[PDB]
From a paper:
Here, we report the crystal structure and biochemical characterization of a feruloyl esterase (LbFAE) from [name], a LAB strain that has been used as a silage additive. The LbFAE monomer structure includes 260 amino acids that forms the canonical α/β-hydrolase superfamily fold with a conserved Ser-His-Asp catalytic triad. The protein forms a homodimer with two-fold symmetry where the active sites from the two monomers are oriented facing each other. The two subunits associate to restrict access to the active site such that only single FA chains attached to arabinoxylan can be accommodated, an arrangement that excludes access to FA cross-links between arabinoxylan chains.
The LbFAE structure was determined in the absence and presence of product (FA) and reveals a new type of homodimer association not previously observed for fungal or bacterial FAEs. Wild-type crystals grew as either triclinic (P1) or tetragonal (P43212) crystals under identical crystallization conditions, whereas crystals of the S114A variant were isomorphous with the P43212 crystal form despite being produced under different conditions. Several LbFAE crystals were screened, and one dataset of the wild type was used for initial phase determination. In subunit A, two lid loops (residues 142–148 and 158–164) rearrange to flip FA toward the entrance of the active site.
Numbering used by the authors:
A (entry chain A): -5 to 259
B (entry chain B): 0 to 259
């Protein structure tokens, strides 16, 4: 009889002087109950909803099945503090690690049943944070990892197909009307995706859609380094799961994974 | 200043929003801009657009409030159940709900729209004209009835398979038959022309919406201003056009909410 209904509430935390703003979906439960929890990392220049309600749908699916879902705007993204011109991926990694501690400190979170979910660059961040905080995560799920982003910018000299070679001349990179700064580009040399990601030995699921513009080889590279990886290739899935059939599939595959790793273990 | 999260219930749906409240004395109220996002968008709008506008207003003493419409973003409701009529109902109800908020000066209250949100704002303003100090519309998607009903496309994709498939696929969201059946109920320009307050429309020359729709609005506004931004696009998705849209809009709301 002890019972409260599910709730969608807004949460904040402070990391390195920035207020990060987020949404928590807490399942139905009893007072004092703690829930297995999935912390979601959005992609580059994205927001915590992700594209076309993607993380919202995933959050509510988890909530309806007894798994709490938490998702923040990264620093310099969405409603969190920070100018895009100051964004660096190293800062995103620092924040992702700090968000594990912040979210585990929330009273409704079962710290022993805590996982990461990523989309696009958020999957890359999740893979690196998982390697550096390996004992903190029950499992790791990565959608459409944008693990080519260093190769693309540093070797192909483009960012989502647009040249990066005018940054010094113009003073910035124009990302859909946001000003991306020199600091982002100068920091890229510091990132090592796969050497760090392979340190995580827990259950990993990667979901890759055959229409993803990221080459499939990057998902296979992850798998080479994972002791307990599963790679699901979704026929006609795309990078953001932007068809009704592939959206249903990504929600199902992910709920299946977190049921197995968080609810049945 | 402070960024607060607000909710209101309309027709059984909880709408979820963000309020940017300026710094002030305890008990102070502020002129307020209520922002309407576009079709299948969220209350941030694309690439931080509404967030940037909200903080610009907040820093200048104007409170900014922006909700996810029903069936959008974090608000309740499935996209398959979305209709424009219920967006118009929610937009009207949001005027009353936001005016009832503690920090909102109900006498200095305006609407801002982007894309379909501008169309909704134009209709609600025409129908609730005494409630609004001013109206600003970015990139109004006022061709949307013509495109769907006459050209049988929705952002370039056919709508002629909806009956057979049971839905329209909008970037992985199921849009339902209810949306299309409801389009016959919608009148843009005869509603919009009723509003006599100051209106500003900002239109970018790279907008895929034909410029003629903004001129049609102007023909019906007694106090309209049309700004054409060279090389601006529908979502203000270049750094120069983003600076321009924020500046033009701050200027308009300074004039209409801070200096009137």
């Amino acid at each position: 009889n002890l019972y409260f209904q599910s709730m969608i509430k807004f949460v904040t935390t402070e990391i390195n002087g920035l207020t990060l703003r987020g949404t928590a979906h807490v399942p139905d439960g009893e007072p004092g109950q703690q829930f297995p929890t999935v912390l979601m990392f959005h992609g580059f220049g994205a927001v915590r909803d992700e594209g076309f309600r993607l993380f919202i749908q995933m959050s509510n699916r988890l909530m309806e099945n007894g798994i709490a879902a938490v998702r923040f705007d990264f620093g310099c993204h969405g409603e969190s503090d920070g100018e895009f011109e100051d964004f660096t991926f190293s800062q995103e990694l620092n924040e992702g690690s700090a968000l594990i501690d912040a979210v585990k400190s929330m009273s409704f979170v079962d710290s022993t049943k805590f996982s990461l979910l990523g989309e696009s660059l958020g999957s890359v961040a999740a893979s690196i944070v998982a390697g550096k905080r390996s004992t903190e995560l029950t499992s790791l799920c990565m959608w459409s990892p944008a693990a080519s982003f260093l190769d693309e910018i540093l070797n192909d000299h483009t960012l989502q197909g647009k040249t990066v070679d005018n940054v010094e001349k113009d003073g910035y990179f124009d990302f859909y009307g946001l000003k991306l700064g020199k600091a982002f580009f100068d920091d890229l040399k510091n990132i090592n995706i796969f050497d760090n990601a392979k340190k995580y030995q827990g259950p990993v699921k990667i979901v890759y859609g055959t229409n993803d513009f990221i080459p499939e080889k990057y998902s296979h590279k992850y798998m080479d380094g994972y002791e307990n990886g599963e790679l699901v290739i979704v026929q006609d899935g795309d990078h953001g799961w932007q068809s009704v059939p592939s959206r249903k599939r990504i929600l199902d595959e992910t709920m299946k994974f977190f049921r197995k790793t968080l609810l049945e273990a």
